[PDB]
């Protein structure tokens, strides 16, 4: 299926200090694989997936240096926006970056990705064309114009279409068993008796990976789009997810209502009822 590598970089400015806290988190196929945190006792790039151990201590050195330069990119970038937006360093500020690439089933380049956010709102984005920039407000024009005169896009297009692609091919090779693995949801319906001669039928789905799942309730083949309570997909903590779907249904009429579960890692869509 599709494959991706992303780097989720964050710089939080701390009032009464020159250096901001800088965190970089790398993801391969939406799963943390590497991390960096300046707050840690002896700060460096650390492996977050077991297949990341099969990397020479000189790879970590190459990467750790990169984090050190980024810390300075962020510190200077934070100072300038503080000026663009006429702000005080008496308070903390947030600069965030998301960069990486997406790959087809054939491991070929689909798109490059580079976005920035200030105070958790969009600031500047590199358009899918990897040539033009999109500024979010008036202040992001100081940066859009700055980045056109310096030709910053060219530098990124080069990496996003070159080195980013290369490295993920390596990561998808070294970790394939772990990366191509899926976990099947394990469903069941719970019965909740209530007032006015009504009942809540909650169909659960547990210990599944990846996070995408579709739970639907149906009255004799017909779907209940309306008045079907859900829950946001929550992590179990063991690397797998949970999610449930409820529907208020009158008593005795239990067997009229059917529950379906859909997920990539399933020998077929689950179909189930109460008992």
């Amino acid at each position: 299926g599709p494959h991706s590598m992303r780097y989720f970089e964050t710089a939080v400015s701390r009032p009464g200090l020159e250096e901001p806290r800088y965190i970089s988190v790398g993801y391969v196929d939406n799963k943390e694989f590497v991390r960096f945190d300046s707050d840690a006792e002896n700060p460096r790039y650390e492996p977050r997936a077991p297949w990341m151990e099969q990397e020479g201590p000189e790879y970590w050195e190459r990467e750790t240096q990169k984090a050190k330069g980024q810390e300075q990119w962020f510190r200077v970038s934070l100072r300038n926006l503080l000026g663009y937006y006429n702000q005080s360093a008496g308070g903390s500020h947030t600069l965030q970056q998301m960069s990486g690439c997406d790959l087809g089933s054939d491991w070929r380049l689909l798109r490059g990705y580079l976005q920035f956010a200030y105070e958790g709102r969009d600031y500047i984005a590199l358009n899918e064309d990897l040539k033009t920039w999109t500024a979010a407000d008036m202040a992001a024009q100081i940066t859009r114009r700055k980045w056109e005169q310096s030709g910053a896009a060219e530098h990124y297009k080069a990496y996003l279409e070159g080195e980013c692609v290369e490295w993920l091919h390596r990561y998808l090779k070294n970790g394939n068993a772990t990366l191509l693995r899926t976990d099947s949801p394990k469903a069941h319906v719970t019965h909740h008796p209530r007032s006015k001669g009504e009942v809540t039928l909650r169909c659960w789905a547990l210990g599944f990976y990846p996070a995408d799942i579709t739970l639907t309730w149906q009255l004799n083949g017909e779907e209940l789009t309306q008045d079907m309570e859900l829950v946001e997909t929550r992590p179990a903590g063991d690397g797998t997810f949970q999610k449930w779907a409820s529907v208020v249904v009158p008593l005795g009429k239990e067997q009229n209502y059917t529950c379906r579960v859909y997920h990539e890692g399933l020998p077929e869509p689950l179909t189930l009822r109460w008992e």
Binding site: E9, S24, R62, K66, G69, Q70, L95, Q97, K146, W147
Partner: peptide
């Protein structure tokens, strides 16, 4: 493997 941003903001 991460990149390094070129020009500052």
């Amino acid at each position: 493997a991460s990149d390094e941003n070129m020009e500052t903001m």
